[PDB]
Structures are given as C-alpha cells and as structure tokens.
Amino acid sequence: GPHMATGQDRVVALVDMDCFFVQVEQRQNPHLRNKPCAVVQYKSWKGGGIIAVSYEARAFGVTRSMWADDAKKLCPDLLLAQVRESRGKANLTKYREASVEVMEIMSRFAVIERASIDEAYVDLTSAVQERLQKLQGQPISADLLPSTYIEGLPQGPTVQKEGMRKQGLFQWLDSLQIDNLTSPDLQLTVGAVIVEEMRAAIERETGFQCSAGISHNKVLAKLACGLNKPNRQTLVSHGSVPQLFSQMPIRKIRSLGGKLGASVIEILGIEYMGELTQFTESQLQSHFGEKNGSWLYAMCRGIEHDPVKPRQLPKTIGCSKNFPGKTALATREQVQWWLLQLAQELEERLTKDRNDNDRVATQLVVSIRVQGDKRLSSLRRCCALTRYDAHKMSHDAFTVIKNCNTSGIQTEWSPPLTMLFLCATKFSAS
DNA sequence: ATTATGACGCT
DNA sequence: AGCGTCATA
Ligand SMILES: [Mn+2]
Ligand SMILES: [Mn+2]
Ligand SMILES: [Mn+2]
C-alpha cells in the first residue's frame, strides 16, 4: 500500500526523428518534399538497399531492408536519394552531422542520452519542477499541448482523428489536479508542455520534424513515441499501463524483440506484456536470470529504473564494409587496399572528433567475417591506437589479422573475407 | 546480397 | 579481452 514503489519519480522523454535520413535529403532537395521517397545505399545490386522511407511511400508498402527494384514494383513513382559514397564505401557523414544539429538543440533543455543517430532520451524531472514553480498553480491549457496524445483517452460515456486527440486531451486536463506539485500525472503533463517546446525548436531551427514520448521511464517513453508517429507526441501515464499492456505483444518492448522475448513467450506460454504480472519475481528470475527477472517483474507494472545517461556523443567511432557473394576479398593486396580505405575514413572522422570534442581514441578494434560464417563477426582483435594516421592504422589492422589467412602462399587470402570493420574506442580527454 | 553502424551484457 | 545480443537509419 503506502510502501509499494510505483516508479513515478521521474519524467523521461524520448525524442525520435521522423523518417530521419529522408528528411535530411528532403531539406537539401526541395523536389523530394511531400513525395513518396526513400534513401538507398548502393545501386548496382537490385537498385540498392532502402534504409529510410517517407510516410507517403510507406502507404504503398515500401519498407526499410527492401531492395529499391522491389520497392519500385509497389510504388513506380518512388523518388530515391542515394547515400554518399567515398573511398569505395557508403559514407554516413551527412546524417551524423544532421544528428548533431538536433542533439545540440535538445541539450539546451536538459542533459541528454544519445540513443541512436536520430533519437535521445531526456530526464525532464528537474525542468518540470521549475516550470511548476513559476506556473503558480495555474492550470494547463490545451493550447500548450497542440500535438499531444494522451494514451488511453478518450474513454467512457466525432469520427475525425484530430477530433479524437482533442477529446482525449480535454478528458485528461479536466481530471488533472494542478494544485499538487508532487502529482505524477501533473508532472508528466508539464513534461509534455516542455517537449512541445523542444520539438518546436527542433523544427524551427533545422526544418526536421520529430515525434516524442513522455512517461516515467525510458522504456515507456520509447513505446509512447511510436504510438502516434509522425509529427506528434504521446503521454503514457502510469495509470494507462494496465490497459496498454493487456494487448501489447511482448516483442514490442525495447530489449524483448529478440531471443529473450521469444523465450518469455515460449517458456511462460503468454503473448502480452500484461500477462507477466501473474508471475512472482523469483519465478521470472528462475527462467530469465536475476537481472532480467527483476527487470521484467517491474517492467510489466510500468516500472523501470534505468537512468538517462549524460552522454551526447557516441563513445566509439567505426567504419565497416561487407564484401558479399562474389566480391569477397581473396587476395592480400585487396584486403590491404580496403583496410586503407576504411582507415582513411576513420582518420578523417577521428581528426574532426578530436577538434570538436577535446578527446582522443586510444584503442583500435579490428573485426572481420569469414565466408561460410554464421555470425555478423567471425573474429575481433584490438591493438593500440597511438596516432591518427590512416596508413599506420591500416598496417596495424593487417598485423592483427594476418594469421587468419589459411592459404599456403601468402599472396592469396583464404578463406575469403566477407566483412572488414575498424573501430576506434577508449577515449580520453585531450 | 539489407548494410552500416553503435551500446551493453556475459564470462 | 573477445563474443553475443539487440538496437536503429
Ligand atoms: Mn526515427
Ligand atoms: Mn530512431
Ligand atoms: Mn525505424
């Protein structure tokens, strides 16, 4: 009763850009705006692989992972923008730089955790308290929440979508108790007001639209964000969790989309997040381990404690390329040529990083895949990164891998390499 | 022949 | 350290 923690101590948001690489290309090329459009890498093999899709194009059934030739079958007028190629490989610099534009704006409101190239978590707890103090018990107007959905509302005793949104928002605001500065629902609502402001700033200052979720923890904020994409934000309250989770497939929750999630379903014979509440913490720990078991026990009740890390910058800088099928590297000079291409991109990015961010990488990680394997990576080895010099890094990378070559004579490389990966890690202040 | 990443957990 | 899992454009 008075002691059961409800996980309502924080206000956390997740901001995720809409169709991000597409919007980056649409800003650059006005001819792509408000069109079915996708971003593609490479072109020779089946028209290239699609990695981002505008919402107009999604309406035709175009998806990520699709070959552009096949997407064109669904959507003959689909417009395509190509990822830059430099040194023989896709180069994602334009999108990393666009990401920094957005992260820097978000950082004006609060410390952020960069969670991907196009999204970040924000702990708004402190900012909410201060906004509450200057509000002085004044109610929150619907006009401050022009793009906000309240998950689970309207409900109880209009056939248009914006009409439903406002109806739910009205029911929510009507019920609020703005008199209590410690009320979690009120705190989320003020959180949502701040995120409207954040999202407006992002759009004003970059031209990019985004969606967001506001809840009491990262997992619920992430889940919330997706509920009303694009260009909208969603508040998931603590009280909304039982209904939301009662029909929510387990795989939809971040971290359960893989093998663990499938094992939860198989072992327990359930389908939805809500069904987990019927197991003791010890039962869940017995099947899924101490850590996972406690995490699941709390998560299915809407409670999660993972903090928003104060980290705006990636903590690794890497370069990788696949060599599929026929193109698998089978000679020494081929392996060495591509190591150099990767190393030169890495050097360029590392040197820029040092100037911008006052830090230096100290470890180089080299990874390969061998034809006939199984796994994204076959072998991973590290060595010292002491100088930002492409020729040295590529020579070092070769040294760490040279023994993987099974071939008798050393001009040839066997068995052929299907992937090379260089990653700089272990940053220190400089 | 989805590819190019990037973070965290296990032992 | 090296491997595995999960995630996202
Ligand atoms: Mn996105
Ligand atoms: Mn994202
Ligand atoms: Mn996505």
mmCIF file of C-alpha atoms (C1' of nucleotides) in Angstrom, chain A residues 103 107 110-116 119-122 218 254 306-316 359 427, chain B residues 6-9:
data_model
loop_
_atom_site.group_PDB
_atom_site.id
_atom_site.type_symbol
_atom_site.label_atom_id
_atom_site.label_comp_id
_atom_site.label_asym_id
_atom_site.label_seq_id
_atom_site.Cartn_x
_atom_site.Cartn_y
_atom_site.Cartn_z
ATOM 1 C CA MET A 103 21.210 16.838 -30.289
ATOM 2 C CA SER A 107 20.789 19.787 -24.953
ATOM 3 C CA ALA A 110 18.309 19.171 -20.468
ATOM 4 C CA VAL A 111 21.202 16.725 -20.330
ATOM 5 C CA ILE A 112 20.532 14.065 -22.982
ATOM 6 C CA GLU A 113 21.375 10.458 -23.695
ATOM 7 C CA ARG A 114 22.122 9.882 -27.387
ATOM 8 C CA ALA A 115 20.428 6.550 -28.028
ATOM 9 C CA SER A 116 20.853 6.396 -31.824
ATOM 10 C CA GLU A 119 16.946 9.856 -31.044
ATOM 11 C CA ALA A 120 17.739 10.854 -27.498
ATOM 12 C CA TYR A 121 16.324 10.463 -24.023
ATOM 13 C CA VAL A 122 15.802 13.433 -21.744
ATOM 14 C CA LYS A 218 12.868 5.192 -20.857
ATOM 15 C CA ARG A 254 12.679 -2.410 -26.112
ATOM 16 C CA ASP A 306 17.490 2.675 -15.990
ATOM 17 C CA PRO A 307 18.801 6.234 -15.833
ATOM 18 C CA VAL A 308 19.128 8.659 -18.655
ATOM 19 C CA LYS A 309 22.852 8.823 -19.148
ATOM 20 C CA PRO A 310 24.567 12.091 -19.588
ATOM 21 C CA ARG A 311 26.167 11.204 -22.893
ATOM 22 C CA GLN A 312 25.577 13.297 -26.020
ATOM 23 C CA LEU A 313 28.469 11.962 -28.057
ATOM 24 C CA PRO A 314 28.988 8.440 -29.352
ATOM 25 C CA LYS A 315 31.704 6.605 -27.387
ATOM 26 C CA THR A 316 33.026 4.741 -30.428
ATOM 27 C CA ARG A 359 39.227 13.819 -26.811
ATOM 28 C CA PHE A 427 38.514 7.860 -25.496
ATOM 29 C "C1'" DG B 6 26.624 1.631 -32.018
ATOM 30 C "C1'" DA B 7 25.695 0.249 -26.933
ATOM 31 C "C1'" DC B 8 25.623 -3.055 -23.360
ATOM 32 C "C1'" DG B 9 25.907 -7.817 -21.195
#
